């Protein structure tokens, strides 16, 4: 009706809520939270011990058939004890659906790799380790995949600086490409682009 607002269908929300209840009652040992967004996306937040059973159940169950892992990633929220939120987006071609599975980790608690469930998880978990430092148990070959050889630090972390700590240049005395502490001719000018007025009253957190 309204030309500027997205149309909303409630049938997808009902179906995803029913399937979330289904998965939650099937796996109460690991499922910690089930939510359906207003964008009609199902998220299941599980304990890190249940990554392998949850992913295996979602891939091999007759009513799930999430045989395709869309992607695997991490989100660094450095204000909780377990700062890395590991996100698995999965696609079911049989039922034309998508699901999201979340779990948590910190810098010193590795989680189980799901290479035995999906083979794309090999390179995806290599990227997660390279960019966040989240180790993965039982990985066939875990190593860096995008950073330079000998790169120190995991650059997608929040506390890692945007420009990094070292920069490369060709030194003619040693006839090599060498790493120096980073100096910028012009510093990256950060901007404070946050309005002091609340934009969304639906997301107003209660005062502390």
């Amino acid at each position: 009706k309204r030309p500027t607002v997205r149309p909303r269908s409630d049938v997808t929300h009902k179906q995803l809520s029913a399937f979330g209840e289904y998965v939650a009652e099937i796996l109460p040992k690991y499922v910690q939270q089930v939510q359906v967004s207003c964008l009609d996306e199902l998220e299941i937040c599980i304990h890190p011990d249940g990554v392998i059973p949850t992913l295996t159940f979602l891939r091999d169950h007759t009513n799930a058939q999430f045989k395709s892992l869309a992607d695997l990633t991490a989100v660094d929220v450095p204000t909780r004890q377990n700062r890395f939120e590991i996100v698995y987006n999965l696609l079911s071609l049989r039922f034309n659906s998508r699901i999201r599975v979340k779990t948590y980790a910190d810098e010193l608690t590795p989680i189980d790799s799901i290479v035995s469930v999906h083979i794309a998880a090999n390179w995806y978990e290599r990227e997660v380790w390279d960019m966040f430092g989240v180790f993965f148990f039982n990985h066939p070959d875990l190593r860096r995949i995008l950073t330079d050889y000998g790169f120190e630090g995991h650059p997608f972390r929040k506390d890692f600086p945007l420009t990094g700590y070292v920069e490369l240049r060709y030194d003619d005395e040693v006839k090599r490409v060498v790493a120096e502490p980073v100096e910028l001719a012009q510093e990256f000018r950060k901007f404070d682009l946050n309005s002091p007025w609340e934009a969304f009253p639906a997301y107003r957190q209660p005062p502390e």
Partner: protein, 106 residues
């Protein structure tokens, strides 16, 4: 058309520049006008996206149609206000015609 600079040092182009390729410093002029004292565009940093020319409220900064301006040193692509004003004076006969042909779409 009077010859006064269109730029009013509002830094909208600097704010919207996705590559942070624009550096602007400003102060009131001798007649009290709000004008820039530094307008630098690092063309080695610029991504040629037109966000500056579509964020400029007075059509001061534009991407004129010159593309054959390759240089032999890295420094010559670090434009300042004198270079940009000279480019505006050089290409005004074409930029004004392009804006005349284009401005009804934007």
């Amino acid at each position: 058309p009077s010859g006064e600079e269109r730029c009013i040092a509002c830094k909208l182009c600097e704010a919207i520049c996705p590559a942070q390729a624009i550096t602007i410093e400003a102060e009131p002029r001798a007649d009290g006008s709000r004008r820039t004292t530094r307008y630098d565009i690092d063309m080695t940093k610029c991504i040629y996206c037109g966000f500056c020319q579509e964020a400029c409220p007075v059509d001061a900064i534009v991407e004129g149609p010159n593309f054959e301006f390759s240089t032999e040193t890295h420094e010559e692509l670090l434009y300042n206000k004198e270079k940009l004003l000279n480019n505006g004076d050089k290409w005004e006969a074409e930029i004004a015609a392009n804006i005349q042909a284009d401005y009804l779409y934007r």
